[PDB]
Amino acid sequence: GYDEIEELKSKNEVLTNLLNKLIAFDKKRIFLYPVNVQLVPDYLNVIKEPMDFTTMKQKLQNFKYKSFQEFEKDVLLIINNCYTYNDPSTIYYKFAEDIETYYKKLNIKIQTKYMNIH
């Protein structure tokens, strides 16, 4: 009903705002789009569950996230895919450590705002 969809739309704004903050933090847009297999041929040989912020945006648009954990799962998948694929000597790896540090500074407060709606 009306209350269920209003809750969904309000929970979506909370997740959209957190996602937008993660996209803005990613200045070089390293996680904004799917890794191009034409430039990185072995990426899917290494990464079983690829994820990016544009995919996450498309999921929010379809109201595909029905829990904070579903959202957080994709965030940490983006970060952990970066640690799995790249060497720690690369900037990609440092970028993943920085977004993980930034995300961990935000997540507790965003998770509360999310839960209060229900």
Resolution in angstroms, to 1 decimal, for this deposition? 2.2
**Cα dist. 53→28, 42, 49 in Å?**
13, 21, 14
Write the single-letter amino acid at 93.
Y
DSSP string covering 27-96 = TT-SSSS---TTTSTTHHHH-SS---HHHHHHHHHTT---SHHHHHHHHHHHHHHHHHHS-TTSHHHHHH
Token output for 40: 């990185």
Structure tokens at 102: 């930034």
| Alpha-carbon torsion, ordered 65, 104, 90, 40, to 10 deg | 0
Distance CA 46, CA 40 (A): 11
Give the pair of three-digit tokens for residue 11: 């929970």
> Could you tell me the domains of the chain?
1-118 (1.20.920.10)
Residues across the chain? 118
Is 73 within 8 Å of 55 (Cβ atoms)?
no
